[model samples]
Target: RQQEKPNFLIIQCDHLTQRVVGAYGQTQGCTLPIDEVASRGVIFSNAYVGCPLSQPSRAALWSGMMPHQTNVRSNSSEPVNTRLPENVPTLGSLFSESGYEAVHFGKTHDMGSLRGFKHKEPVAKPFTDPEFPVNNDSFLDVGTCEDAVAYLSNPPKEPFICIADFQNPHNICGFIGENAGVHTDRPISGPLPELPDNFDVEDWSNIPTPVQYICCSHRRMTQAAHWNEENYRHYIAAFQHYTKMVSKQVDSVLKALYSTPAGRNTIVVIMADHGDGMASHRMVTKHISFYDEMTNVPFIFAGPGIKQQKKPVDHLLTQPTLDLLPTLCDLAGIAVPAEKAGISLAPTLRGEKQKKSHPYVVSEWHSEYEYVTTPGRMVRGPRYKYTHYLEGNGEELYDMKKDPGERKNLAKDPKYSKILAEHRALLDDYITRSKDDYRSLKVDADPRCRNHTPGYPSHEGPGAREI
Candidate 1:
């Protein structure tokens, strides 16, 4: 069946992994609501994120441009960039300009083209900024979730777009208040989720360590290399809690919609900007991007005229973040601009055809803590995964299907030279195509988010002088 224009309702959470969600095959906790949505929706299996930070990823996504094209490669200390250059059109603006009411319920961090929605001031005020919310009551995910429900209750015209971004799960850093501090605070008791046997956790021995955790907020360590193992698990538990919270909020929105005469026709979609490391490969952070545990994310689409498929897609779906604007635009009856880089999921949702939507998924990281980059850009497909340590930096490549842990670097290996070359070509192709989309303007991207954070050694955790 061909799709007619339908109102779009999108839900996004920060730094979440698809692995933890019940819909993604987890039996430990029950995400009943999201699971129900998945049963009725198209659950994308191999969704990947372009860049895994909050501001830059959101910017790349909202603008429908690549991270290099949008110039949002990292979160910055600069003021909010709300202007949509005529060259870069935003999803909200397209829907709004086309006569649909576009609304952003929370996390107005999408830098460009907020379009026509009345941007709500954040209720889950930044823990650092208790002032902008202005009122004392405005300070967390509950406040943001409540704000969304209030907006959804109001009846928009039949074809309206409402994007509700909940900031839970992403809300870390000591875990006070709504964060509950449970996950980040847990002790490593079990041997983590059994990794796919081919998993590789190699060390970039040639490349010098990036930062010292002592100077950074990411100093907490449990066991993972280049990561805080303690915080990684905490992030997982917190993600589960808030995702469940988000699911409940989604229920409220649906209830409000179901009560409305036009609710049945709405197309509800949910996805995360990126996945957290959760120290799955004995690494604490997601900055390096070699692990599947770092890049693969969650994406679900459900509603009227919806066709649901439960099979996990093994092919690469490409950047989950990049798909945001085009998918929303497609659902809202808005024609995608020629400049947009993402393929619409309208076809993927139907699951009628499954050719590789994008040849490969690219994940990028640029840290100015000490050097240009150690783990610059990571590209992966179903059969292979390649990590390109910058040009000057020694290159490290992995065959994920065969070496899932990414321990062995095939770049210098003689056995798979042709496979390594193929991935290099793919990476270059991606860089060329997306170079016009999102790029870094910052001189020091790492310092912008830290206090001179440290890196863990092969034998030691985060700190000076080793363990």
Candidate 2:
């Protein structure tokens, strides 16, 4: 019926970067299927994750809050508990409370309890295939798609919210670790992906100490640091292959949805938890850095009531993980939580004028798995992106329009002092308004937490330096 609420289908991927997608200007055909979805829907060209790490980012998406608000800053284990607070209102809980059948499939990571999902089918086991040298996520993704397709083929009487979270290109991590050394001896098979413009570590000598420590803090980074030009290309090539594999499964899921009645009225959102670092600044994986390759991801919305734009909506900045809950609530005619950190994109989605544009979007970072505990924040404005760390001389400002590659740091530039101050003030106001305790929280100065590498910078001694 016309009065009925639209169904929601959220397809989430892992570690897929926007730079490698066709809709985001990548020449590679890795995401042709996703590009098709973009053509039919409105694309948020500058979408970012709430947090760069998996658990925190997923928590932000489900709760419609920042990582700090959820108290899930890192993927640390045990005594350090990385679970989402039990009392928070999540998209699943909210939708279920409103008479929707909420279901989820595939990876949930360290999200604590799977709150509010009526039917939850997490991946049973990692895919094991001898042919594929590294671990495989296709088996997991395909299984997840099968469950979603089955449910969509015979949906419940009530409107539903279904999440098909796929794990892929994330497998690139295993691929790198398993094959980093072997690939060097193999001959070139075909055309390898081009190196990123900001590929050299030497060019970033002036970067903050905490960030520098991150470069060599993890085993993967150390392996990647030794990679030659050919090795880098091979890694990118494998990443593209993995992305394409996931795209096909995503296409299959969409096709199944369209074959059923629920498809006509479904509000589909396709996005990633966070982007991968595909050799940007000599970094291969995420965490500890605020580079676009690690933070900027693909976010697309389609189906009923969404404006079909010829080009992506580039002017608006978005944090998809934070915005998803509000947008879905708006689309389904539910009341958005007044306390949410994100704003509904319903106005822009329906081609209506927004009363006011967002002043900026922010992302939080906290490194834990690798034992280093460096806290940082990123502020992305219309043209400039600013990053502030809670330790050492960690401040970065980039003119996105002039240098998308982020080769230059304008934070310390004399001419941009006013701009830098404005961004810093914006961050300060946000911290106070959001009640973010990142500033007062003590940095971990345990001897084991300090980067012991001879050349890398250490986060020992005092806390945050004066801006």
Candidate 3:
């Protein structure tokens, strides 16, 4: 390994939106600091998370493989324990193999144990086992930020990979306490946003297309509405505070690292594991297949080998994480392992492909967030948004450029027959190529209660299952 190689710093927030950043010209200033950071590098305007579900998405991020290809599909899923096959090379494994210091700052959520890397601190030595250090309980109670700051500031070598993971603002894992905010136990303190223009009760009409791709059973509709109706100002205020908190922590690490020539030799990639539903479409949490709201992540890169004061490359950015492995290899001047599954973003960073690179994006939203709903998949291209629900039911196709709000469903229209054919072929091709059986991965409703759920009716309905 080259001692003078560029450093790697990955800032991963739990669930924040790139659209909310003022720099993107999407929202006001809830995320200005990020916007400013965007000015220094490239802001992947159309960046999409490979999978909307956490574990699977994180799998894609670290492993640099597609969701189905990686065999990781949802939060708390047992892909590792299910006797499934592990995909090619992972970023961490690659870095560790190359002798680069690989330190996971927080929440790899690899589940059960930490199997890769060297000198994992905050983590008890040998995190591969449940009890490795002084304590016998497998040291799962580590503070992510504190550990990251320590790793960033006092590292004894150059060419280290630090993943600063944050689960704040994701407030779903735990409650924000009662005296927290106007909403239940949510602890935010900002003004409630106005009702979304598409907050219509009929949002359920198009067979369950979540803009962020979240789904709600008929039972959860009210609860989702409550979450949607509730203001997140207090919760959002806390989130903003934490965003700054994490940023401050990163800044400290940057300060410590920049003290040496190695800091300038480093490459920084700031992003999120995924975005929270945040009630964009009268919905609350993120745990379904819906739309770009949850699937689209905030992606920004700064430092060495990256050329730019700032520019928005909205070439329909698809999956930046797929490119994570290749980009790291690029920055470190190493060869990306053949086993990796994503594209190398280094080309785009160098001002190559200024106009476009990929044409479409495919995102999968799985995991039973609640009880009934199974999972879903969405495909977004330059003009159309096509969604295929799990279990051969509920298909939604919309022309986003024409109907941004997704008010109407074009999956069934006669004129769209040709366009629908193209999308379906592409969807099927992806399913086939990934070796994912869309038809076989059926909705798992109870064998006895067939009529209970409205969204996943036994037979497909209008605007459903076009292909």
- Give the per-residue lDDT of model 3 (tens digit) for 293-325: 677788888777687745577655557657777
lDDT of 3 at 450: 31
Candidate ranking under lDDT, highest first, comes to 2, 1, 3
| Overall lDDT per candidate, in order of appearance | 0.60, 0.78, 0.59
Q: lDDT winner among the candidates? A: 2
For residues 90-192, write the lDDT of model 1, one tens digit per residue.
7767777888777787676666646557677655443443211112322456676777777667764657888887765554423322222223343434344
- TM-score leader: 2
Could you tell me how far off, in angstroms, the CA of residue 432 lies in candidate 2 after the best superposition?
0.9
The residue ranges of model 3 lying beyond 4 angstroms of the native Cα positions read: 1-4, 77-87, 111-115, 119-142, 172-192, 201-203, 209-222, 227-245, 354-356, 369-373, 405-407, 447-467
Residue 244 lDDT in candidate 3:
43
Model 1 accuracy (lDDT, Cα):
0.60
**Poorest 10 consecutive residues by lDDT, candidate 2:** 458-467
Q: TM-score of every model?
A: 0.79, 0.92, 0.80
Q: Any idea how many clashes model 2 has?
A: 0
Assess the local accuracy of residue 146 in candidate 1 as a C-alpha lDDT between 0 and 100: 72
lDDT of 2 by residue, 255-301 (tens): 88888888888988888888888987777878688889988888989
Question: What TM-score does candidate 2 reach?
Answer: 0.92
Ranking by TM-score: 2, 3, 1
